[PDB]
Write a protein that binds this ligand. Structure first.
Ligand code: DMX
Length: 159
């Protein structure tokens, strides 16, 4: 079955710019700005739309070695990005896939809000733990903060 988790966070960066950097240039930025969270991102197949497979490797000493993520949808208008964890890490005989949905909304102050949905699909019913969910949210925040800091510091980047 499916376990559904939703979380929200804010950014000081406008939605369009953040979407261009944090979502659309993730393969490039994550290992550059957050090397202690993501060691590399390899494009396995595809040119960046639905079905594109990427292999995300974690640094030495992390709980997991790598995950394979697949792009599900990319909406450039409404800054929505759906992707699934499809192999590696938590995926195996207890968890088939994690489907994720990220939407970035502009706020009046010039910042943005990110709305994050994570659906865990389980082999029958292997209870997804609060600690797996925390770890996921934390890694996303670490990633978001490293990118945010790079965009604050490099005003020419992603205009
Ligand atoms: C995984 N991201 C979409 C970041 C998600 C963080 S969050 O859960 O705080 O929204 C980026 C990503 C990068 C490369 C490939 C596929 C996805």
């Amino acid at each position: 079955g499916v376990f559904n988790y939703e979380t929200e966070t804010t950014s000081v960066i406008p939605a369009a710019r953040l979407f261009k950097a944090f979502i659309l240039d993730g393969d490039n930025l994550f290992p550059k700005v957050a090397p202690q969270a993501i060691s590399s991102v390899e494009n396995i197949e595809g040119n960046g739309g639905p079905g594109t497979i990427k292999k995300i490797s974690f640094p030495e000493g992390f709980p997991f070695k790598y995950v394979k993520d697949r792009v599900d949808e990319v909406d450039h208008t409404n800054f929505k990005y759906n992707y699934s964890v499809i192999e590696g890490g938590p995926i195996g005989d207890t968890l088939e896939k994690i489907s994720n949905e990220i939407k970035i909304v502009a706020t009046p102050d010039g910042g943005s809000i990110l709305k994050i949905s994570n659906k865990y699909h389980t082999k029958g019913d292997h209870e997804v733990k609060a600690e797996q969910v925390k770890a996921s949210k934390e890694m996303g925040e670490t990633l978001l903060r490293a990118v945010e800091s790079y965009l604050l510091a490099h005003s020419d980047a992603y205009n």
